[PDB]
Amino acid sequence: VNVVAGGPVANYQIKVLDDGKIDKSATESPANNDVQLKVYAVDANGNIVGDITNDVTITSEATDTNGVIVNASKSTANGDTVYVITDNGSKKVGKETLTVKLGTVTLGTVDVEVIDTTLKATVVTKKADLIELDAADNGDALAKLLANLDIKDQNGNPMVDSAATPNTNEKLQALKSVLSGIVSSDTSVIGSVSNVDNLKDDASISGLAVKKAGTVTLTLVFNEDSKIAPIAITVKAPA
């Protein structure tokens, strides 16, 4: 639009140029990492008699109260000012109220929303009740245990290892995001895992080392948020 000589201002518009959302995912396509605002003064006939985006000040709550934290910055290019709202350390998702002032006078408010569309492990199931290790497992049950699980995201799609990345197993990473611990029925055969970070992501995953030949039940326990029930898998580690 253009600013034009018109009549006296009748009202102010706080205009959202984009979708009004900020996606704190690290990979969303297309990138969705801001909200962009204009503030216009308009006369009785809708003529834009002022672009006051550069003159106003936009703020959010001084002390955080909802785990949603945003920054507001005036960005000027091509003669035009856009008020750019960005995520700044939001721990949660949800709405954040912006207040738009001209000097000390409030012109209005507008909410922005922080979202997160990251693919998230949502369903985990076991394929078989039992797995048996052989020499290829090199005395560690983790690879064969992972192969015995199916992980689905919130869309119900599989979460699997990408062969494009040789040194990180995306499926293991998906598991660890919802796993709280692994209990072994006999820690002398295979140790229990209480710190899930000890499930080592690498070209060759590891962390369920066999201490001696035998048979154990491994029970996977998941976090409360996921609501996934424990999964028990019997592991035979033959001599």
Residues that bind Ca ion (CB under 5 A): 18-19, 21, 23, 25, 32-33, 64, 66, 68, 161-162, 165
170 labeled part of a ligand binding site: yes
64 labeled part of a ligand binding site: yes
Shortest approach of Ca ion to residue 49 CB, angstroms?
Answer: 28
Shortest approach of Ca ion to residue 208 CB, angstroms?
Answer: 19
140 labeled part of a ligand binding site: no
Of 133 and 174, nearer to Ca ion (C-beta) is 174
Of 74 and 211, nearer to Ca ion (C-beta) is 74
Diameter of the chain measured on Cα atoms? 91
Distance between CA 31 and CA 21 in Å, rounded?
A: 11
* Residue 143, C-beta contacts closer than 8 angstroms, at least 6 positions apart: 137, 204, 205, 206
Element (H, E) at 215: strand 214-222
Shortest approach of Ca ion to residue 78 CB, angstroms?
Answer: 20
Of 11 and 75, nearer to Ca ion (C-beta) is 75
Distance between CA 22 and CA 28 in Å, rounded?
A: 10
State whether residue 137 is helix, strand or coil: helix
Distance between CA 201 and CA 161 in Å, rounded?
A: 11
219 labeled part of a ligand binding site: no
What is the number of H-type helices and E-type strands within the chain? 2, 15
Of 175 and 235, nearer to Ca ion (C-beta) is 175
201 labeled part of a ligand binding site: no
Q: Which residues are annotated as a binding site for Ca(2+)?
A: 18-19, 21, 23, 25, 28, 32-34, 61, 64, 66, 68, 96, 161-162, 165, 168, 170
